[PDB]
Amino acid sequence: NANVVVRLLIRRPEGLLAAMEEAIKIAE
């Protein structure tokens, strides 16, 4: 199953650490 899910996780994709850093001080 570990093979099958990631193959179906490339057919649609969804920098992450470039994006999740910007919300690390997001408030109101």
Partner 1 sequence: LSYLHVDAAFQQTLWSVAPISSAQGYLIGGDVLRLLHGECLTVPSGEHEQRRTVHYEGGAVSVHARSLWRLETLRVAWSGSHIRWGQPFRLRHVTTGKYLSLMEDKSLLLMDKEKADVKSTAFTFRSSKEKLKEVDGMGTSEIKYGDSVCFIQHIGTGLWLTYQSSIQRKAIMHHEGHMDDGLNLSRSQHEESRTARVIRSTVFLFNRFIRGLDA
CB of 10 to partner 1, least distance (A): 5
Q: Which two three-digit tokens encode residue 14? A: 């969804």
Report which DSSP code applies to 7.
Answer: H
Nearer Cβ to partner 1 (6/27):
6
CB of 11 to partner 1, least distance (A): 6
User: Would you give the end-to-end CA distance of the chain in angstroms?
Assistant: 41
Name residues contacting partner 1, limited to 1-28 (CB under 8 A): 10-13
What residues line the site for partner 1 (CB under 8 A)?
Answer: 10-13
